[PDB]
Amino acid sequence: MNIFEMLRIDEGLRLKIYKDTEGYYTIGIGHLLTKSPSLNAAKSELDKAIGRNTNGVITKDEAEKLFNQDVDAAVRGILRNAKLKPVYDSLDAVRRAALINMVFQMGETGVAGFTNSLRMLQQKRWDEWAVNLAKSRWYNQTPNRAKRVITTFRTGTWDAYK
């Protein structure tokens, strides 16, 4: 299983624009179009992204291209972040994907805020770090997923996912 598989499972695959949980415009595999409401606002952005007039519908292939870019980009946000980079480096491979998953869902900034979390993590703490996480808005708005992610982190295994 890998990062790509991981998130594909968590974000699903939609070929036509749609509203997320927070009610945002999205398409593909978790690709956020606009923190706005103008459905046109959103087609424009889709247009800019693919580079074609899409009328709000794209291809699998295209959804996958957004995706790669999206996963890559998270990977670098982490490596550029001063607080995240090193956490990332200290972890094994599964746990890292988990990290990458988080960031994808909430941005380097969002993530790098777990100031506390931050090192328990690095301390090779979990458990305690985990409970902290269950006490967050994040967890409370998408528990299923949050759990699968927290589980993966704690355990350094893909159990939650199969």
UniProtKB/Swiss-Prot annotation:
Gene this chain is encoded by: E
Impact reported for residue 132 to M/F: 2-fold decrease in enzymatic activity
CDD domains (UniProt xref): T4-like_lys (cd00735)
Classification via InterPro entries: Endolysin_T4_type, Glyco_hydro_24, Lysozyme-like_dom_sf, Lysozyme_dom_sf, Phage_lysozyme-like, T4-type_lysozyme
Protein name: Endolysin
Intracellular or extracellular location(s): Host cytoplasm
Keyword Hydrolase: yes
Result for mutant: residue 117 to I: 500-fold decrease in enzymatic activity
Lineage, broadest ranks: Viruses, Duplodnaviria, Heunggongvirae, Uroviricota, Caudoviricetes
Main location: host cell
GO molecular function, one term: lysozyme activity
Substitution effect: residue 11 to A/F/H/M/N: Complete loss of enzymatic activity
Family: Belongs to the glycosyl hydrolase 24 family.
